[PDB]
Design a protein around this ligand. Structure first.
Ligand code: HAI
Length: 419
């Protein structure tokens, strides 16, 4: 069980290169199952789910190899069943289903079970494919889908916003006969990226980024080269790292327009920010941040995946700021840990009232949520003394070696294997 021993305080300054977003690479890699010709997917991070996905695609008959790019040749996919042993560690595996049924007429994916029923993640994927004409068969543990002929474009109205089902429906719709219209579509930049990838292969999609996506089916998709967009959450994490340590940083290989709400909030906290075509710089001019008011909401509003980081920012800022979480009902586990680090905060239902203090003190802390864990590592960078963040594998699965990026910004951090 690896942990990070972090010693502070350190002002974080310098440059950091933003990695491709795993949440865009994953749906794009599964979308590549639709490609009849070789595809090169650029800027793919080296993370566990990517390895899991490459192994799964290989099991389906895809030829795959990687470095910064992942090269895919799906011309001869010939096994349309994704087995339990290859999907069990990854929910994103459901994304193999739509492309398999859309292109080959059959697909099956094993699904981890549960005693809980109703609103299980895969339900909207299933019902969306059913609306496109697929015949769905369910037995605990798996979903099999097939279609007699080609899928048929349909007007689908999503009752709740779902990034996963939007990707499944949009991707499968690219090879359906006719027009598919998705109402209340998820607007996330990763949806836009997946849509642009499909268009690069020959698909006809418009409206990506808005609540209504229109797909005009085509007979087949080809191949090409496509670069995965930058990880907007990783970017926000490094911007916050500088913002809370009186730092100065330049985030390279970034995409500013996927972060409008985050950059606006950082400017409210007192940051001097400039943006370029593929970069964002932030300078606190050595000052402590000013507390801000945050309300998470669906993209393009402020992202829940930046909530823990901004709570930390408020907890060392000047003033009182309230963070309201409207997306998840229990995403505040970082708070007790920070309070153990000397922070002053009160939880009131779906909000945390923060009363900024000048300095935190090191402690042994841990959070299972990826963003909460990474925020503890950032708190460790500015706290006096030693902070030990346990169960760092959560971070490793969503950030490409965060400690090396932080160390290059001046952090004193080390991976301790065990203790
Ligand atoms: N009997 C089959 C069901 C669909 C996927 C391939 C195996």
């Amino acid at each position: 069980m690896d942990k990070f021993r972090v010693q502070g305080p350190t002002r974080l300054q310098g440059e950091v290169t933003i990695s491709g977003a795993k949440n865009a690479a994953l749906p794009i890699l599964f979308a590549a199952l639709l490609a009849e010709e070789p595809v090169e997917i650029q800027n793919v991070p080296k993370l566990k789910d990517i390895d899991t996905t490459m192994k799964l695609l290989t099991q389906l008959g895809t030829k795959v190899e990687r470095x910064g790019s992942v090269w895919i040749d799906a011309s001869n996919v010939n096994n349309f069943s994704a087995p339990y042993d290859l999907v069990k560690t990854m929910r994103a595996s459901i994304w193999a289903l739509g492309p398999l049924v859309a292109r080959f007429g059959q697909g099956q994916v094993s699904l981890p079970g549960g005693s809980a029923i109703g609103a299980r993640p895969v339900d909207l994927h299933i019902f969306g494919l059913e609306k496109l004409g697929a015949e769905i068969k369910l037995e605990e543990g798996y979903v099999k889908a097939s279609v007699n002929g080609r899928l048929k474009g349909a007007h689908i109205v999503m009752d709740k916003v779902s990034v996963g089902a939007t990707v499944t429906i949009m991707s499968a719709a690219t090879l359906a006969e006719g027009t598919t219209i998705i109402e209340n579509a998820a607007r996330e930049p990763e949806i836009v990226d997946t849509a642009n990838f499909l268009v690069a292969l020959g698909a006809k999609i418009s409206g990506q980024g808005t609540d209504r996506i229109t797909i005009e089916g085509v007979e087949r998709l080809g191949g090409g080269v496509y670069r995965v967009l930058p990880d907007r959450i990783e970017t926000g994490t490094f911007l916050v790292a500088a913002a809370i340590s009186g730092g100065k940083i330049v985030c390279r290989n970034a995409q500013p327009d996927t972060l409008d709400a985050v950059l606006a909030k950082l400017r409210e906290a007192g940051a001097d920010i400039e943006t370029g075509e593929d970069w964002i710089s932030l300078d606190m001019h050595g000052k402590r941040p000013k507390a801000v008011t945050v309300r998470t909401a669906p993209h393009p509003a402020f992202p829940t995946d930046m909530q823990a980081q901004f709570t930390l920012l408020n907890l060392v800022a000047e003033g009182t700021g309230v963070i309201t979480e409207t997306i998840f009902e229990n995403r505040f586990m970082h708070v007790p840990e920070l309070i153990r680090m000397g922070a002053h905060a009160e939880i009131e239902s779906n909000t945390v009232i923060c009363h900024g203090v000048e300095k935190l003190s090191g402690a042994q802390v841990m959070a299972t949520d990826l963003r909460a864990s990474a925020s503890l590592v950032l708190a460790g960078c500015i706290a006096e003394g030693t902070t030990v963040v346990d169960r760092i594998y959560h971070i490793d699965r969503g950030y490409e070696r965060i400690e090396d990026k932080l160390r290059a910004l001046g952090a004193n951090i080390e991976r301790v294997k065990g203790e």
